[PDB]
Ligand binder design. Structure first.
Ligand SMILES: Nc1ncnc2c1ncn2[C@@H]1O[C@H](COP(=O)(O)O)[C@@H](O)[C@H]1O
Ligand SMILES: [Cl-]
Ligand SMILES: [Mg+2]
Length: 843
């Protein structure tokens, strides 16, 4: 049972308060090994309390603003504990200790949980309004020294030079001065026009409200990589933090497809030596804008990062909140402002696993004792899966290694893919090899079905019917007349007719005569039909009676129906032998013209073998049975009609030829579906929308399969079809004409359909590749240009050899000499489940 919209948002609002309870505290712990001497702790504990004025400072409202109340020096509030277990005891105790809220009014802001587990567990906690990250590190310096003094006080040994109230009084004057304005002018200039949101590929769409659920992984740079990065940093004058910042910004810009990347970094902001050792809120955030346009080298990028990091650390006094309200006074609610990725360098007991994510990714790294670099990468679980973050950390380590190998190469072309993912992308997700007969042509699939069911119904048109044997005999007669007119292998036969029984007779007869058919839709303007008729240079024009299209140019014209078609009824109805025609699977099956994009239409030459594979895959995936009917509704100038014609005829089903221009009657489609028991039909998504919006669509409960292709299928439309026809199996198919109708398919059978309906997995004997501008495979989730391989790649464009070599390129992956890929010009990406997602056009 789903929650309402008001209930769903109110839940996320209530959990932001739970996120605030844990993220506004500074937890920590220390393992104590030594003689049981509590007699020295309380003396050492209260000594650090009274030493720093912030440890006992209270806050409250007075005269419309929060006031600072310096309190009389008090004692430490420690709770006695006696541990009872191990795993569940320590993990839960240490968790609720950090999540236990304080009170800014009364009650102290330093909290401690001590326990005897000889050996004691000393948990400490401070509030962020009186401390930060460093403030606990100096809390460990004093606590360790004061216990030593109380074992062998505070201020007399080494007094503190200042207290936080003096820093706040100084900041109040600095914020009003002209140095604040100039630092505000630099940050307004540095981050002007910066990308508001990084487009890192996410495994799930970004929620409307930011989800603070977080998880983390562990990553380390081994002794070799940490050593090489130190030498690389020495050679370019950068520190080890700047070298990692350059690599991470280089990785993110490559993964997100953006030129610039903004990465945040927390700084202590204790620039003045007086503030060192003091306890309080000093940490500030700097937004680092790294540009990567122009394809810089490793040295050029490190020099850019060297300039921007130094300039950022010189203007680190301005609060980051004032940077936002100046640049972005109008911000979003689904992501953090200015930046969404943070890199913290923690150069130096241990804390627990970070389960909160204030940003998309937060990379924490530190320099270990053995010279190695270790840390964690915390990610928002609502955006990324764990395996995606692990591959992300692998890319960074791979990119850092390449920078050490050569600091002069282009940084954005360094290989980052691991061998496991590369093999999965290229081979494992393309394991579509299926054993189909590579010796059969398209018309022979029909002829084999004629022998199995000669008296079964094959064609239906406005009451007229043709059985499999009757259709085959009619096609054989016309095929012999075509053979007498020079039709043979690779020769074209133009066909100009409206939908009728004779349309299918013509197509089968051309294929039987060994030629390739060229569909000429009479609805197109005469100028277009005359160009395609001249460009294809056919041997014969099969013309329906009433059509006035005249080719000239020595082209033979045969009447397809009417009284003028009677002469070729005298031909014998027997089948032409395999040698009488001479056609083979590598010969052309049809030439279908696409309008290109802007200009003259181009004839796509498609061979028999690819069409047979496309048809044989469709039956294996969907199992069309002889008793079913398919509706021939798509104009035969579109290659969708190819499987509408030849899929049912190859398996024993019947094909219902829709009325010409019949859908002009708004009720014709529904009445024909019900009246003819239509089980399978095709829609382009724009036409499917009109179908689910049409009157009486719910009467079509007998429909079995709806194939969608040609456009992007919106998930809302797919979900609308379920509500109207709960029984129909919806399938999303993708593929251009140059790859034989379709090459990927995705069943819309999931219990919950996404808004972006995937185009799916490659079909039988077909391969798919997502490549960058240099023909290299991109990481999972990264957008790139779709390339198609396998048997369904067309021969090329009829009469345009230069465009053919431009879009039909050698296949370097198939391991087969002579194989070719088709560059689609479409943008796509792999999902982590091995399915493809259409994203749009490359241009
Ligand atoms: N299922 C689909 N989803 C999104 N786009 C598609 C799909 N099928 C085809 N296209 C686009 O339409 C172009 C031509 O497809 P077609 O009309 O089937 O030849 C392709 O090159 C793609 O850009
Ligand atoms: Cl050309
Ligand atoms: Mg297609």
């Amino acid at each position: 049972a789903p929650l309402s919209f008001a209930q769903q948002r109110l839940w996320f609002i209530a959990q932001m308060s739970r996120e605030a309870s844990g993220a506004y505290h500074v937890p920590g712990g220390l393992r104590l090994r030594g003689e049981l001497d509590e007699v020295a702790l309380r003396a050492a504990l209260d000594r650090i309390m009274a030493r720093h004025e912030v440890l006992r400072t209270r806050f409250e409202w007075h005269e419309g603003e929060p006031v600072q109340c310096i309190d009389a020096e008090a004692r430490f509030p420690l709770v006695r504990q006696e541990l009872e277990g191990e795993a569940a005891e320590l993990a839960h105790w240490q968790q609720v200790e950090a999540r236990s809220p304080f009170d800014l009014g009364t009650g102290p802001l330093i909290r401690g949980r001590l326990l005897k587990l000889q050996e004691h567990v000393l948990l400490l906690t401070m509030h962020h309004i009186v401390s930060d990250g460093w403030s606990m590190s100096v809390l460990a310096h004093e606590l360790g020294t004061l216990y030593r003094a109380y074992a062998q006080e505070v201020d007399p040994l080494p007094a503190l030079p200042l207290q936080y109230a003096d820093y706040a009084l100084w900041q109040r004057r600095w914020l009003d001065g002209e140095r604040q304005q100039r630092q505000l002018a630099y940050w307004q200039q540095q981050l002007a026009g910066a990308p508001a949101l990084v487009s890192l590929p996410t495994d799930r769409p970004r929620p409307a409200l930011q989800d603070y659920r977080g998880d983390s992984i562990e990553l380390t740079f081994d002794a070799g990589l940490s050593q090489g990065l130190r030498a690389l940093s020495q050679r370019h004058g950068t520190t080890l933090y700047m070298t990692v910042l350059a690599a991470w910004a280089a990785l993110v810009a490559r993964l997100a497809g953006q030129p610039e990347v903004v990465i945040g970094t927390p700084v202590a902001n204790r620039q003045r030596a007086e503030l060192e050792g003091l306890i309080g809120f000093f940490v500030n955030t700097l937004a680092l804008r790294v540009d990567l346009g122009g394809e810089p080298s490793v040295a050029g990028l490190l020099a850019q990062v060297r300039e921007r990091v130094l300039a950022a650390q010189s203007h680190q006094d301005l609060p980051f909140e004032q940077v936002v309200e100046a640049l972005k006074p109008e911000r979003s609610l689904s992501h953090s402002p200015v930046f969404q990725l943070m890199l913290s360098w923690e150069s130096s007991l241990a804390p627990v696993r970070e389960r909160s994510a204030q940003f998309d990714l937060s990379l924490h790294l530190h320099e270990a004792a053995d010279g190695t670099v270790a840390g964690s990468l915390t990610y928002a679980s609502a955006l990324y899966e764990r395996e995606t973050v692990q591959r992300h950390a692998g890319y960074l380590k791979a990119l850092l290694a390449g920078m050490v190998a050569d600091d002069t190469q282009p940084v954005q072309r360094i290989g980052i893919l691991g061998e496991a993912e590369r093999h999965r992308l290229l081979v494992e997700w393309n394991d579509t090899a299926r054993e189909h007969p590579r010796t059969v042509c398209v018309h022979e699939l029909f002829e084999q079905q004629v022998e199995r069911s000669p008296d079964a119904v094959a064609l239906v048109y406005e009451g007229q019917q043709l059985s499999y044997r009757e259709l085959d005999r009619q096609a054989n007669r016309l095929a012999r007349q075509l053979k007498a007119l020079g039709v043979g292998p690779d020769e074209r036969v133009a066909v100009c007719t409206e939908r009728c029984l004779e349309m299918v007779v013509a197509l089968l007869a051309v294929l039987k005569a060994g030629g390739a058919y060229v569909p000429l839709d009479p609805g197109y303007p005469a100028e277009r039909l005359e160009y395609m008729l001249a460009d294809s240079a056919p041997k014969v024009l099969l013309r329906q009676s009433g059509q006035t299209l005249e080719p000239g140019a020595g082209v033979a014209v045969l009447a397809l129906d009417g009284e003028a078609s009677q002469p070729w009824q005298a031909q014998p109805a027997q089948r032409l032998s395999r040698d009488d025609s001479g056609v083979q699977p590598h010969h052309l099956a049809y030439v279908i013209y696409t309008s290109g994009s802007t200009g003259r239409p181009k004839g796509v030459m498609v061979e028999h073998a690819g069409v047979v594979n496309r048809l044989l895959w469709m039956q294996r995936a969907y199992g069309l049975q002889p008793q079913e009917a398919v509706l021939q509704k798509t104009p035969f100038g579109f290659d969708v009609s190819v499987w509408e014609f030849f899929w049912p005829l190859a398996v024993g089903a019947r094909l219902v030829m829709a009325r010409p221009q019949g859908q002009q009657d708004p009720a014709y489609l529904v009445e024909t579906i019900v009246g003819q028991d239509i089980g399978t039909l095709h829609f382009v998504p724009s036409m499917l929308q009109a179908f689910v919006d049409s009157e009486g669509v719910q009467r079509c409960r007998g429909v079995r399969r709806i194939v969608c292709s040609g456009e992007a299928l919106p998930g809302a439309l797919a979900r609308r079809l379920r509500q109207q026809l709960p029984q129909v199996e919806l399938h999303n198919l993708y593929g251009p004409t140059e790859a034989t109708v379709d090459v990927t398919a995705w069943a819309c059978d999931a219990a919950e359909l996404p808004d972006n309906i995937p185009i799916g997995r490659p079909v039988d004997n077909t391969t798919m590749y997502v490549l960058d501008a240099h023909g290299q495979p991109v990481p999972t989730g990264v957008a790139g240009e779709i390339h198609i391989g396998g048997v369904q790649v067309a021969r090329g464009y009829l009469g345009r050899p230069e465009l053919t070599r431009e879009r039909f390129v050698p296949d370097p992956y198939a391991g087969r000499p002579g194989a070719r890929l088709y560059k689609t010009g479409d943008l796509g990406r792999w999902l982590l489940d091995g399915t493809l997602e259409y994203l749009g056009r490359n241009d």
